[PDB]
RNA sequence: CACCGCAGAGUAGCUACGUUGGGAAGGGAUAAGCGCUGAAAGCAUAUAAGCGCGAAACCCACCACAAGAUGAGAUUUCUUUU
């Protein structure tokens, strides 16, 4: 409700169209859909308006949800969003040909990743520091569905800390 | 004839104590559990909408049988009642 009611200005340069059911919105990357259901929504051509029709404890939450799913659709075709996996621990390396990267862990073998093509990959490595990846990208699920599953092939250990982490990110550690 | 009288072997067959093979590989939906985005509840939250993983368990998959499956299927050919 109360996240809901706010306007979703959109910074001019991108355009949002709504159809029967999918609502889609054009910037300078691409491309992004959406289907809501129990929302109306309305563009009027700088806001757009998002109302509900019944308080029933479902369509409540169904207003700032799709609220904010467009909100963030907006705010990422203009602009996108992006996040850093940095990579702690001996012997471990990270490359990229690409759109490919090469993770080499602890592992008995090494770990090519083809990430889709509707995401960047850079890394840096330089000379000793830890070798920081960066992806970007215009559909935050994406992003953060392709980091977690990163992440995944090593979980951060408590005693010394390697691991897949993001940059920050303080982590839980015990004396071991 | 005497346990096939006894004793030494023995092809075919039948067996193991012998030989060969098998429980391999690959999908779907999941349990405990692990996450993405995100409100209700301006925060937070793996969930309420929607998504990604997840076991010798379940459905395929491997082998055998199977249209009396009365819901009695299909195809090719022959003859059309001595």
């Not at 169904?62 to 909100?71: A, D, T, V």
């Not at 996996?85 to 090519?112: F, M, P, T, W």
């Not at 995401?119 to 935050?140: H, M």
């Not at 994406?142 to 303080?170: D, S």
């Amino acid at each position: 409700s109360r996240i809901g009611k706010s306007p979703i200005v959109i910074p001019a340069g991108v355009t949002v169209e709504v159809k029967d059911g999918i609502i889609t919105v054009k910037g300078k990357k691409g491309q992004l859909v959406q289907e809501f259901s129990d929302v109306n929504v309305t563009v009027e051509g700088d806001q757009v308006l998002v109302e509900r029709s019944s308080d029933h404890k479902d369509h409540r939450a169904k207003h700032g949800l799709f609220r904010s799913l467009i909100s963030n659709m907006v705010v990422g075709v203009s602009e996108g969003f992006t996040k850093e996996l940095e990579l702690v621990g001996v012997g471990y390396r990270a490359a990229n040909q690409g759109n490919k990267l090469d993770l080499a862990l602890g592992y008995s073998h090494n770990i090519v990743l083809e990430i889709a093509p509707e995401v960047s990959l850079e890394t840096i490595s330089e000379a000793g520091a830890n070798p920081i990846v960066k992806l970007t990208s215009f559909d935050k699920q994406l992003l953060g569905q392709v980091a977690a599953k990163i992440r995944g092939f090593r979980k951060p250990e408590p005693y010394k800390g390697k691991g897949v982490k993001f940059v920050g990110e303080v982590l839980r550690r015990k004396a071991g």
